[PDB]
Structure formats: C-alpha cells, structure tokens
Design a protein around this ligand. Structure first.
Ligand SMILES: NC(=O)C1=CN([C@@H]2O[C@H](COP(=O)(O)OP(=O)(O)OC[C@H]3O[C@@H](n4cnc5c(N)ncnc54)[C@H](OP(=O)(O)O)[C@@H]3O)[C@@H](O)[C@H]2O)C=CC1
Length: 273
C-alpha cells in the first residue's frame, strides 16, 4: 500500500519489485505469470481493476502492464487497445478516488522514427499499432499530477540482446534491423524509477539508454561472449508484421540532470541468462 506495481511479473516489474521492496510496501499484480506474494488481476476486467485499487489504497501506482509483442498488437488491435490504452483510463479514474500518485510507463514506438533523439515535447506519430495503443494510453494518463515515463528497448530475460545471445550461441544467424534505438536494462530503468518516485516528478520524462543500432548491439554481444553464428543487418526483418520506426532513440538529457544514477550506459550484465 506504499506502491502498486501493475505488470509486476514482467521484465521491468520484476526489477521494480526487487528494488522497491527495500523501503517500501509493495503490491505486486500479475495476470498469466504467477509471482511470489503477488495478486492475480486482469487489468481488462475494469470493475475488478477499479475495486482492487480502491481497496488496496496504494500511495503510488506504477503502471508497467502492457501487451508488448509488437506483431501481435498489429493483428489483435482490439486486445492491444484494451490493455495498452483503455485500462489506463480506469487506473487513472480509480487512482483519483484515493488521490494516488500515478506513474505510467510508455514507449519510444510512439514516434515515427524519421528523426531520432526524441525529447519529451516532440510530437508522437506512431507507425505501428503497439505504438498507437500505447500513445492512446499516454493520452488517458495525461494528468496535472501524473508522470509518464517513456523508455526504449527494455531488456532482461527477453528483448533484442537476449534474442541475439540465444540465437548466436546456437550458431544461428541474427537478422538485425537497420535502425537505432536506446535500449535500457530492466534493472537500470527500475533504479531510475525508484529515484523518480521519491521526487514526485510530474509531466513526461524520457528514461532510456544510449542511441545504438541493432547491428552494432548484436555484434557487441557476439564479441563480448565470442559467440559463433552470424549477424546480418537487414532493411526489413522477414517475418515482421508491423513496421518498426527507423530511429526511435530517445533524448534522456532531462533525466540525466535530475537523476544521480547512470541509467543509460549500456548494461549487458542486465541480461538474464
Ligand atoms: N519491452 C520493451 O522493449 C519496451 C517496453 N515498454 C513499456 O515498458 C513497460 C514494461 O515492459 P516489459 O517489462 O518489457 O513488458 P513484459 O512483456 O515483460 O511485461 C508485460 C506485463 O504486463 C502484464 N500484463 C499484460 N496484460 C495484462 C492484463 N491483461 N492484466 C494484467 N497484467 C497484464 C504481464 O503480466 P503476466 O505476464 O503476468 O500476464 C506482464 O507483467 C510496458 O509498459 C511496455 O509497454 C517501453 C519501451 C520498450
């Protein structure tokens, strides 16, 4: 009842739970993936969601829950909307009743990727439905006293660095999208969010890694671990349904001033196996 973490069972949520539990009374919500001491709750059951919030009385809600499979979002748009956008409306509504501090997690895929180095005030223009559903959630989350944290390429037990490590280790070819983003480990992102909490920051804030291409990232991890298997850069990845933004890197300069911790230097040790 200090802090509700939705998406507690996901990459960011696991790490948030670990760190917040130090200081810090934590309510951990999962749906499909059971976690120790968690509460099972489907955020698309809106009355059950609102009741849960009003009953548990979190001082703080961190909304990390989402449908993050980009290609699945492109086909199952109704499902993506309900969790990535509409649930946020209900989190905000119930939160307001208890005057909770709402921290909502968003994505670099809200941008069209034609510019890169996006700052907080740059205008979203998503080119895939994951990005659009998330942008609609941002829109519901926009409140005088809420905080939207946009991030990029969260990695822990999944995300691109893991796909690279597992694929190359088995001698297979990695097809690396020609384009940039700003990958941050779940643990570094969690550490930043903890700092932000104490501060009761409001508005929008970018918290992500250094700008890097998928190709360089893949080859760094190949070099790091002398992995076999080839890295091939491709203009378009075969099998992809959704279009990815060319350069969705974020400009996190504001957060770099605010926060003490280096959340941005590439953290490959944040990979989980
Ligand atoms: N992953 C990435 O590359 C990036 C992610 N983001 C954003 O960061 C946040 C965290 O992402 P990440 O940790 O990687 O995502 P994960 O895919 O690892 O976790 C998704 C979480 O959402 C929960 N969830 C999904 N649907 C529901 C639902 N219907 N009801 C309750 N919980 C649900 C899942 O719970 P369960 O498994 O228990 O069902 C899981 O805890 C998200 O907001 C994401 O959009 C932003 C930029 C990059």
């Amino acid at each position: 009842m200090r802090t509700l973490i939705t998406g507690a069972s996901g990459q960011l949520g696991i790490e948030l739970s670990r760190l917040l539990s130090e200081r810090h009374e934590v309510i951990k919500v999962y749906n499909s993936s059971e976690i120790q001491g968690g509460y099972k709750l489907d955020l698309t059951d809106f009355p059950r969601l609102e009741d849960f919030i009003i009953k548990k009385r979190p001082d703080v809600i961190i909304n990390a829950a989402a449908m993050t499979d980009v290609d699945k979002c492109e086909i199952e748009k109704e499902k993506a909307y309900k969790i990535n956008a509409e649930a946020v409306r209900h989190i905000v509504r119930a939160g307001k009743v208890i005057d909770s501090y709402i921290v909502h997690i968003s994505t670099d895929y809200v941008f069209d990727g034609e510019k890169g180095n996006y700052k907080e005030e740059d205008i979203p223009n998503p080119i895939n439905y994951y990005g659009l559903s998330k942008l609609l959630g941002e829109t519901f989350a926009l409140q005088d006293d809420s905080l939207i944290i946009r991030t990029s390429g969260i990695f822990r037990n999944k995300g691109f660095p893991i796909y690279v490590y597992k694929t190359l280790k088995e001698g297979k070819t990695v097809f690396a999208f020609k384009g940039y983003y700003s990958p941050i480990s779940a643990r570094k992102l969690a550490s930043a969010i903890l700092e932000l909490l104490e501060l009761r920051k409001t508005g929008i804030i970018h918290v992500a890694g250094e700008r890097i291409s998928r190709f360089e990232l893949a080859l760094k991890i190949k070099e790091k671990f002398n992995l076999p298997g080839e890295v091939k850069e491709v203009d378009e990845v075969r099998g992809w349904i959704a279009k990815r933004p060319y350069d969705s890197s974020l400009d996190s300069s504001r957060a770099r001033k605010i926060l003490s911790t280096d959340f941005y230097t590439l953290d490959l040790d944040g990979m989980v196996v």
